[PDB]
Design a protein around this ligand. Structure first.
Ligand SMILES: N[C@@H](Cc1c[nH]c2ccccc12)C(=O)O
Ligand SMILES: N[C@@H](Cc1c[nH]c2ccccc12)C(=O)O
Ligand SMILES: N[C@@H](Cc1c[nH]c2ccccc12)C(=O)O
Ligand SMILES: N[C@@H](Cc1c[nH]c2ccccc12)C(=O)O
Ligand SMILES: [Mn+2]
Ligand SMILES: [Mn+2]
Ligand SMILES: [Mn+2]
Ligand SMILES: [Mn+2]
Lengths: 344, 342, 345, 348
């Protein structure tokens, strides 16, 4: 015996078309996705000076809270639309080296069953509702298969720090319909993210699944709307001198020198109250010059901090988020600052 | 939807390949026991040295089979000291443009003919196992393994994907032992982490033998280990080995590890592989109980070329030639004969 | 060029699992399907002397109407449950040589568009509701692929006169979880139906599709609960003499000699009123002896007759049916007659 | 949903390689494509009366041994070339006789003739044989029994049959509507011709039927319709090959506004299931061609290397299904038909 020795089971997976038939994209959702992708493209290439704000929970573990959060964020989206382009974080799984909760797609029931068919349906339904209420959505694509279930509803995608250097993730990015952000590496390596944009911009052949759930060869056209995200290393890398050094390197590689700064993760050193400090520093850069900044990322929820079990409503069970109060503060700060950049 | 997709193309499922090239009794037996033998090495139940040795990449099956036929003689000759398993990597991952590997580009001309490539890959691997040479490879994605993992005795996850969750989940379901390299700037924690993760059950999305998407529930891979392949500085010496083994034991994982003689440890100079090997040989005489394997980039002919003009010469990373391989292998054999006595 | 020369398009087909996931079979529907299949088997093999009545529209073109019909039929199902085993006709298409409306699965919108995905979803939705309210369902399986979408909701199946002689339909029958009736051929050939019962009782290997929509080899175990249906020919064949001759031939092939009589189609000469005459003759055979009769088939709707376009609620757009009044009478007539046959045990 | 209702009477569902796996190993060649393409057009011409050659669908009742088949084709090929101005000879390459009785289920189903079922091997063997035949210059004809097997080798078929037992089946008519080759519908097993006339009707229109893609996934196939369909007279209770039956069939066909050019099966019910009588039928057809017989566009003959039949595949090139005429009788029968038709063609 040499085949599937360490496989316990192979289970039935509904193909993407099953979900697309139940939850077809609406006219409005298409329009919103389409133009949000264009609008972000314009930010990536320096054609517009608004600040892309990718903001929301670290992960989504409860769609009801996600929709209530979206309702609130939507008012600030409209209010700040001339200064900020606000797009909600709708991430289904925090990649984790240890055991623990495996994300909404994997474990929608939050009990260690794996009900991926239900997860993908829930994921798509939440995304469709969000787009339907005027809130565009962003997410991190972890594998090569899940995107076929809801990428059509995504206006901006991330490739995480742990996969920016992975070739098949760069290939995936090269065929994604949405702009894509590549994070610097977990120890602060920027070059891998710069290379990724290089790779992602060219055509690739990668193996994936058709909408019908059958393996196929996908020939991509390249993604011209990729960029770097500074999310910290051994040290934080959000300040002006890091930004400026990043911008030089980007120009040096012939790619866009407009980048995004993540206020969270290793830039806050995992202390959610520091996100505001980073946003303050970014505010200060925009007021002085900050021409290379095109966006920021913030981990924000209804209620602040985090919990191991999903006991409190609207409170993260992955990374600790700022609460809604602080969120209003932060967005007002960034709006006020960028208005003054856009006048200059 | 699919705005940046040029084309979606027909892909034969693994069963089409498995139907034309079914694994043989002899190939199954060889894979089965080479896996056991390597498992014994990983867990410190046998003190032979695993040697993953062969071309950086396979671009010409004829040369590969030739190389194997010479490598087989040495495998048999050193069977008490070394467990020799040929490197049969089909692609070297590259940030920039260039040849994309045998699976992607079997014709070496920039056409993609993945169906032909997967067939060639499986046929080469089956022939190699049939003649008595087991095979090792790097699994880059979650689909290609279904086409030939049954013919593979040891697997690598590359430096670039050791931190990737889905690659760890893949390793958790791989029938073969798996080596995780430290990161391209020398980070070892990510490989230790990767071993921990890979030893547990996971649910990942992939494709059945029949080419249909499915949820695969894995049992966990107990036969994982790390590979020291250098970082900003090389990490092959006795001090690095010792500090690595302390870290591995601290994490509750096997402290038996493999050392790559090429790539960052040689400073990307193929000549230096022998210096690393010498250093490893010297550790084996003094103590070196934490070393279970070495990795060597080797071919019929030394160095490298941009186009496949010269027979048996790598077109990816530069390799030592057949000579320097007879030397490196003797050198490792001699040194480990001593280990296994004392 | 040699491939797909005369093919206009190949279109996306959701696999059975997609429908099974949205409309899983309920506990109650399962129990009812299970039990009804058993109860029918007992009739096929002469363990119970109730009369199976397959009754309802010639074809379903309107689920609302079908449900309302079921609600009324249900009361009579219960009322006569000791004499009659009443199962509703839920046929989606009447196969036709000519052009016209192609059934609910093919043309659920009744406008000449094709929307088979919607059709299959509607068909299963209706079948699940019917079973849930207590009404078991029967249908004609026309191809090898549609049964995966809803066979689990079907308590009795028919293979039509046009396909009884088809080997692939016999093979299909040999793997269907429900009893199956085979009709004599459109000119009155009975041998093909007897042959079909023989064939369907054995194991076969045919090619079909898994629940997941992938082609596969199905090894079937054989269907022991098949029987013939007398549906007329060049002449009608519902009378005692035809029944008696049909039973002789059945015993002679070593298959069950309990058969079903279709009161409609070529036994009524397509003139729906005459169904009552056939039932009357069936009642009269039951009173005398009628040991070989285990079921009847009747084409019945809320409103009698037929129409070309679906303008009048609850009226067939395929073969003309008797309306509700006559349905009550036909059922009372059959119940009364069969009560007397069961008493003579 | 605790009570069981699903796959109660299924023993097993097994793996089936999709058409593309066979098409990859055995792609159609330029020569085979050319031959299929033109043989179909040539047959279309006969169906629509633009050419007065006679289509001759001739060969074993069923193929149980590809080596014998190839040897048979080599022999038939010399007569195909020799009579090419009078006859259009196409080989019968039928894999499986439909049977009510248990017994051998054909080469696709049971390629090892031992009651195993190795349909993957069977389909590979069927395709290989059909490709070998087209590559040597012998076009091939077959009967399509199910909706799935055609995807494996219809690209190598120049003419298709719908059998007597399925001519009335709606799905088979829909299948015919999307088949790339001309198609003949047989009359029913008791002699009903109207079903075959209806079938031509139906097959000529567009349909939607459910089948499998080349990749093995179920799909909806929207067909264009098949304009190259015709009827086959194969007898009933009584034989139906003579001039009066022919003439009565032609009036019915015209009356239905379909082609009044038909094919006559010399075997099966027209021969009373007696292989020797095939020559009788051909003799009668020859007599019709000399008189007038304008409505006849083809004939069907069950022919093999060796005459008769056997239950076990003991003797080489001898049928295990319906009894066939041997090779001697075949040369006779074809010379007979050639000579007769040469005279018809000269009168116009
Ligand atoms: N559907 C994705 C691209 C993509 C990812 N994986 C695929 C597999 C097949 C086809 C397309 C894809 C998009 O439009 O962004
Ligand atoms: N077949 C692989 C395990 C595996 C990798 N990818 C898969 C996808 C599906 C099923 C199994 C797998 C092995 O034996 O090592
Ligand atoms: N599901 C059907 C049997 C069946 C029909 N077609 C199939 C194809 C595959 C497997 C089973 C089937 C039943 O239970 O009656
Ligand atoms: N391929 C067949 C037609 C056909 C049969 N079944 C199909 C399913 C899908 C597409 C085409 C088909 C031909 O060319 O004659
Ligand atoms: Mn986070
Ligand atoms: Mn290398
Ligand atoms: Mn009817
Ligand atoms: Mn025959």
């Amino acid at each position: 015996p040499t085949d599937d020795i360490k496989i316990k089971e192979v289970k039935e997976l509904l193909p993407p078309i099953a979900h697309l038939y139940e939850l077809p994209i609406s006219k409005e959702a298409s329009g919103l996705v389409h133009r949000t992708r264009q609008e972000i493209s314009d930010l990536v290439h320096g054609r517009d000076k608004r600040l892309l704000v990718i903001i929301g929970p670290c992960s989504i573990h409860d769609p009801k809270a996600a929709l209530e959060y979206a309702e609130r964020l939507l008012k600030l989206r409209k209010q700040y639309e001339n200064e900020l382009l606000i797009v909600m974080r709708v991430y289904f799984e925090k990649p984790r080296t240890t055991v623990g909760w495996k994300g909404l797609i994997n474990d929608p029931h939050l009990d260690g069953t794996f009900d991926i068919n239900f997860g993908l349906r829930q994921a798509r339904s939440l995304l469709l509702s969000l787009n339907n209420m005027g809130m565009p959505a962003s997410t991190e694509f972890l594998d090569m298969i899940t995107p076929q279930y809801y990428a059509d509803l995504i206006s901006w995608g991330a490739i995480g720090a742990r996969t920016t250097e992975s070739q098949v993730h760069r290939e995936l990015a090269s065929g994604l319909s949405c702009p894509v952000g590549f994070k610097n590496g977990t120890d602060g390596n920027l070059k891998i993210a710069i290379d990724a944009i290089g790779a992602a911009s060219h055509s690739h052949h990668f193996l994936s699944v058709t909408k019908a759930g059958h393996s196929a060869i996908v020939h991509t056209g390249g993604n011209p709307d990729c960029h770097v995200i500074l999310r910290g290393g051994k040290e934080p890398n959000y300040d002006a001198e890091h930004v400026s050094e990043a911008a030089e390197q980007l120009r040096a590689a012939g790619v866009t020198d407009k980048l995004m700064i993540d206020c969270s993760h290793a830039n806050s050193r995992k202390d959610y109250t520091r996100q505001m400090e980073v946003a303050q520093d970014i505010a200060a850069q925009l007021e002085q010059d900050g021409g290379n900044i095109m966006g920021v990322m913030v981990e924000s929820h209804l209620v602040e901090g985090r919990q191991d079990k999903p006991e409190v409503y609207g409170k993260s069970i992955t990374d600790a988020c700022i609460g809604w109060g602080a969120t209003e503060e932060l967005l007002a700060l960034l709006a006020g600052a960028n208005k003054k950049r856009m006048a200059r």
